[PDB]
Amino acid sequence: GPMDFLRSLDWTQVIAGQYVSNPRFNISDYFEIVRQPGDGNCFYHSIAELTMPNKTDHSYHYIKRLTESAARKYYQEEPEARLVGLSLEDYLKRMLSDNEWGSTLEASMLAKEMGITIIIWTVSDEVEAGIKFGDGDVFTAVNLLHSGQTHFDALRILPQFE
């Protein structure tokens, strides 16, 4: 059909609740890029942008608080926790520090804690992969753009696609 590409994304299971896709498209053909501050909190700024209506400049602190709560429940069982290599207490001290980069590990934990679905699109703006945490689809997902290997922005589906 016309204009319904996003309705047919194919997600392959990685583990229960995490999926990957490899659609071929340019991000800006389907999404508005909502640019976030370049500081080290950009991951949490991006989540806040898409989950907290009429937010404030540093609404991301609430998301980091939710990350703490999530980590206390889930960190020891996250496969990416093993890559970080820290005890829960040392992880929390690092994670809660100003400007400490967020990641797929916090996305995984926040999807559980908040009940949301998060998709990180990694990229030109030519998509290489989407990685999805949670079982929802792209239309109610928190869509993030990961670019330059080191930066997050928020994405919003363009109106003509719904």
């Binding site: 995490q18 950009c42 890559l83 990694t122 992969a129 990685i131």
Partner: protein
């Protein structure tokens, strides 16, 4: 006895690796790190929906010739 398996990267490209079932997951990660040019603490592996644990031998997971393992990126920013 040596066998070939496949490891699929983020872009969806599979590459072939010669392994032994006695070697560890960690050592397979070192081979994948060399081929893909990504540090071994920036990805983790799965097979058939199960995370692969670094210290365990590959044979604990029932890999067979040309089994596909996923290389799952850790993305930070």
């Amino acid at each position: 006895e040596p066998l070939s398996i496949l490891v699929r990267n983020n872009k969806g490209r599979s590459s072939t690796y010669e392994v032994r079932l006695t070697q560890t997951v960690a050592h397979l990660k070192q081979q994948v790190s060399g081929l893909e040019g990504v540090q071994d603490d920036l990805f983790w592996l799965t097979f058939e929906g199960k995370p692969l644990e670094d210290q365990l031998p590959l044979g604990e997971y029932g890999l067979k010739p040309l089994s596909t393992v996923f290389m799952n990126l850790r993305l930070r920013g």
